[PDB]
Write a protein that binds this ligand. Sequence first.
Ligand SMILES: *[C@@H]1O[C@H](CO)[C@@H](O[C@@H]2O[C@H](CO)[C@@H](O)[C@H](O)[C@H]2NC(C)=O)[C@H](O)[C@H]1NC(C)=O
Ligand SMILES: *[C@@H]1O[C@H](CO)[C@@H](O[C@@H]2O[C@H](CO)[C@@H](O)[C@H](O)[C@H]2NC(C)=O)[C@H](O)[C@H]1NC(C)=O
Lengths: 384, 285, 48, 288, 48, 48
Amino acid sequence: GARTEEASYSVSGIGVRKNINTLTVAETESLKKALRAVQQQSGPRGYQEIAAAHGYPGLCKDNGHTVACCHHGSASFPQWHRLFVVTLERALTLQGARVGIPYWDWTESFTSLPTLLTDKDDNPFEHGEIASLNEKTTRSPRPQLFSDPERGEESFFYRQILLAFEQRDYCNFEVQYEVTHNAIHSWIGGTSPYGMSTLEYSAYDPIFFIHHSNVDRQFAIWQALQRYRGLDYNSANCNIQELRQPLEPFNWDSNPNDFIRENARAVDAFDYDQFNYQYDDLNFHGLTIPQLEEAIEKRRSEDRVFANFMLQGFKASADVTFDLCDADNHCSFAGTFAVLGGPLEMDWHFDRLFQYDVTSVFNQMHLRPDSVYHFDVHITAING
Amino acid sequence: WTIPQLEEVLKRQRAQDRLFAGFLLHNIGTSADVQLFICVATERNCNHPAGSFSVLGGETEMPFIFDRLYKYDISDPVRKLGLKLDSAGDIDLEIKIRAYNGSYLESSVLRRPSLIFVPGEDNSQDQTGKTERRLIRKSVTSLTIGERRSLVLALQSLEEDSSATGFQALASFHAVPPLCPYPEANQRYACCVHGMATFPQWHRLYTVQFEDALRRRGALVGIPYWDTVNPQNSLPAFFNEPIYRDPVLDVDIPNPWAGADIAFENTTVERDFKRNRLSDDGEHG
Amino acid sequence: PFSFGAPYNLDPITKEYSKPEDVFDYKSHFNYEYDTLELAGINAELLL
Amino acid sequence: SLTIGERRSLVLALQSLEEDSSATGFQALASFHAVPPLCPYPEANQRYACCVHGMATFPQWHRLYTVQFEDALRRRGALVGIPYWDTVNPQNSLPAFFNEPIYRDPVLDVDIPNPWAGADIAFENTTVERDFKRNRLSDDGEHGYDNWLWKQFLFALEQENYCDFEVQFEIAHNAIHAWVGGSKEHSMAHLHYASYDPIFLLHHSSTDRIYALWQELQRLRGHDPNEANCALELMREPLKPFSFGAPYNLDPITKEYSKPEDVFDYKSHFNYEYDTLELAGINAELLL
Amino acid sequence: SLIPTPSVLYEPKSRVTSIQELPPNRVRHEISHLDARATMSLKAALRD
Amino acid sequence: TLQVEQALLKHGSTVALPYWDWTLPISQLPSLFTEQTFYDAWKDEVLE
Ligand SMILES: *[C@@H]1O[C@H](CO)[C@@H](O[C@@H]2O[C@H](CO)[C@@H](O)[C@H](O)[C@H]2NC(C)=O)[C@H](O)[C@H]1NC(C)=O
Ligand SMILES: *[C@@H]1O[C@H](CO)[C@@H](O[C@@H]2O[C@H](CO)[C@@H](O)[C@H](O)[C@H]2NC(C)=O)[C@H](O)[C@H]1NC(C)=O
């Protein structure tokens, strides 16, 4: 007879996260088959129950309310989703995957969905099914997704990223970063409530994981540029008391992984050295860290006007628009954004304010702030 | 980690590409350290370090020189600084020497460092799936010892054969005995097409008929051609000396190219080289 | 006599090429080429 | 195998180049290769030569140098690129094409002193002398073709890595230099007098041919024919003095290919190609 | 002393299998695959 | 005119002497004749 001498399936020395266009046939098919297999099978590597952390039925309790307490507006947002994606990657590589999940950046002037979502035969990325309530999730792209009226054919999110990277302190990054995180979710969810604009159906679509990989990437970009500029790059100096609680449910006994269990905290989450996941080329449009600083410098060296807000939750999901009307009431579009919310969440709050650059409209319409004017804000639900 | 589960971890580590820096080093007198700086263009400034390592040295130590280069990894600082992983032309490294007692040494004591990048092991197959067999013909004046010996031995082997695919039988197509248009007809004559419109076709099919057979018989190269358009003050010795001296065996063989004899008529053929004007020159060279 | 087969002519590779009408593209029917189609050190365009 | 017409073209071109004294002349080329040394930064107090010897950029620099010579010669007027002299085979005797100091021009029905026999140096007014060792040519080995450098080139032509190629490529390159320089220092054996010798061109053409052979030798093994991964710290700058423009690097093609990376795509960048990518009467397709 | 003292390196065996290329003689075909030309050539070259 | 190009080629000229045109609108004598001195960058001298 003969002995197999196989298995033991070590999960360590985690590989790389390449771009969507830097993939070949073998790796793509391996990733898709692994995703389908882990979506089918149940257990510790159970995709459905591991994704149940963002929606139905909810697995968290607060003041007699059952929710999915994935932080979605507090000051601990990035690390929760970082550990989420790490858990998914570890689960998929435990069964024999090849590399970590790719990232689909949006800062380019893309005119359509990537090639991953355009496949038709046995690709799990196209649709998501939940046995708990038995329906198919649907994507609702909108024409404004590929159109930007404020500046032009440049990507909408470039302005948000540049107005997010100038500052130094930490807890004033989430305020300008969560809006960009959630606006894409809302737009890709579209008019169909069974998509990503909601919360219960936003967890069973790989687009969610790809988006979260990209936002983790840009958070790492922020960390690296802060390290270069010479400030704190492993912790935060503001709002400590919420940066110590266990990152539930990762501190339960239902954690198949061991490493994340003991260090499923907030401060130690700022370093990914031990988590073993790494990026290939974190460059930004081919512009590197020795370039972003003076790009931001030349952006902020001029005079600007900001339409500051104080956002708050209302347990619902709806897009936000605002229009500027001068003394003669020449109402005109100036900008828009979104907000994250659902019936299965807790009433979050922003510790600090929110900023938005509106210099273009004033400079074009000669509306120097010495005059009289007003903004009308419309809160448009996903059904209009 | 025990033995049977870290080998795949090492393979995974080697799988992706990495950056590196190369050092050469020897005895310096006293144990000290090294310092790395990543000089990057803006002019250029050098403040952020990559890493460091140390060397051992003492005044009583045996003088020595190493053989092969020493590898160090700078992948983590390079990637964190975020420049191009592979197109790292503009990065320049800087060397600083820290002594044990806090002193410094000028970097000229050691050789200038290099920079090395290695691609990952993502490659699966490297060798070409299949080559292409094509024969190439060269002039008689551009032969070398190896293939010349190959050709001469192949021809001398072919000549002395007496089979159906023998030299005599193959060359018998041209003339006597006549075998054309077919032996069945009571009229027998040769059909070396001459003056008609199939001359090149017949005389090229004849040559290829010899060529493929001889290539199978053991020639690495096609038949050499004695171009005559240019002047020939003295004809090449390749077909003059009856005896060819093999370099390998140091043997002497009657060269088949030098001459040959007829089988069924058994009478030697000579060559009339009228050197009166075969070496023409004209009045413009 | 190349039209004749065995035993008069033994090789098979010229039997299918005994037709004179299709023995011009030697580059594809005989896989044998020259070093260069030169003439006494003069190439095609110069000779033209 | 060169013809009489090619010999005439080459001899007239060399006679032309060996007489003018412009910025494009034989003395100028000697200046580019060696003393007076004006490298890398001419205004610097230290004097250095651009002949990069002892690194990975040696083949690229010499290939670009031969490209410059080819462009100059074809501007002068010639029908073929500069031929290569191969020494791998054991030659019975030295070819007389440059050995014979008097070349017979049949078109003009006259004789001309051959410029390939030698030359003279400008700023010293002394003629460089040619030395030979017919014993070196006679060196053949037991198998005849197993010459002294045959084994060396064989050992050179299989290194999968790139940066370990030049380490013996340089010793092969200077082997012929030693074999032809002789006792005299004013000869091929010294760097300071290398472009004053015509055979320099022949030997370096042969070296470029061998490098070209390796270009597909590695390609059959399936790798990058334009890879310089292990020399990034040295490939960051254009090759000198070709990085300059006026008044030295007059040729715009050399100026705009002054970069070291792009010199690898020579087959489509310089419209010149050796007829036989071959070594010693046998092609690489079975050398593998 | 102007050159460092040298060392010795040992390049070992290479147990990888290789497919050698040789002319289509001194290569032992199988008997059935032989054709008429080969058979006649062999029998003549033996009876000789 | 023919009597001079061969002489210049013998004396080491890379190109022959071209012609002077006036068909195009002519304003001033062309620059190749205006200057009187240049710097060689080969002997630290000048030449008219
Ligand atoms: C369709 O539009 C209605 C009208 O706004 C949305 O109803 C809101 O959300 C829930 C749904 O019953 C309730 O709180 C109220 O009916 C509305 N609340 C607020 C604050 O407007 C409804 O949600 C929309 N449909 C979807 C799928 O979102
Ligand atoms: C640190 O150690 C080095 C190594 O010994 C010292 O350098 C030597 O200094 C002595 C006298 O100071 C000289 O005689 C030697 O020639 C030096 N050798 C070398 C290799 O530098 C150095 O002086 C020490 N630091 C201080 C501050 O004294």
